[model samples]
Target: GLEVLFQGPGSMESLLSCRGGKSSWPELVGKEGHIAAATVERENRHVRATVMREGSPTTQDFRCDRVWVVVNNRGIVVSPPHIG
Candidate 1:
């Protein structure tokens, strides 16, 4: 089973700055035509993550490995660039 760790304050907000800004989430979604999921991970973990455009399967592959937690429809809804 995967460990559900509780991140401290600024954990979620940190990812916002990493993706450029808070208003860039839609750009990623618009290009992919779907909400981009945001993820976050420490520098120690070996698991790798990636972010790809749902509509543009053939376009350049964008790897979001730096971020380890994807904020999809389950929890919070992020705005532009941040993913949802």
Candidate 2:
């Protein structure tokens, strides 16, 4: 396991960069929660993560060059709506 040390907005920018296709941030961005589970589709380079917050579920699908794990820490959470 590798830990990426980053700070400020640039940190998020880098993470999202790996996302492929038309992907946007999930609504669970700025809430208290944890990644309950995740699935990887290695053949298609896709990963889906389920975030549980307030007893509800939110999903994030990532199409990346490879499958990787994302960790959460105490930081400013900001998710902008996808622009059509």
Candidate 3:
């Protein structure tokens, strides 16, 4: 798998470039966690699927490949997954 490397805020900015892959997945809200992850990965080749619980212990570090698919306790995606 390809790794999304970052050099600072500038690197993060590149993800938002006009040619970059999809960065936000608002349409995935209210879907199954893993399923949303799969859909995100397919739309953004630069991202890797990652399922996480809401309010989970995690860092705010940014990475183009780490799409946070936040889910509820019921295994449903409670929020739109986003690339960081």
Report the Cα lDDT for residue 31, model 1: 31
Q: Which portions of model 2 show Cα errors greater than 4 Å?
A: 1-22, 36-45, 48-76, 80-84
Candidate closer to the true structure by lDDT (higher is better), 1 or 2: 2
Using TM-score as the yardstick, the better of models 1 and 2 is 2
RMSD of each: 13.2, 12.0, 5.5
Q: Which 10-residue window in model 3 sums to the lowest lDDT?
A: 11-20
TM-score leader: 3
lDDT preference between candidates 1 and 3, better one: 3
Q: Rank the candidates by TM-score, best first.
A: 3, 2, 1
Residue 83 lDDT (model 3) = 71
Mark the 10 consecutive residues where model 1 has the least summed lDDT: 14-23
TM-score of each: 0.19, 0.22, 0.73
Q: After superposition, how far is residue 29 of candidate 3 from its true place, in Å?
A: 0.6
Error of 2 at 56 (Å): 29
Task: Report clash pairs, candidate 2.
Answer: none
Task: Tell me the tens digit of each residue's lDDT in model 1 across 1-84.
Answer: 122233545564222222322222333333322223422222223333245322333443333323222234443333333212
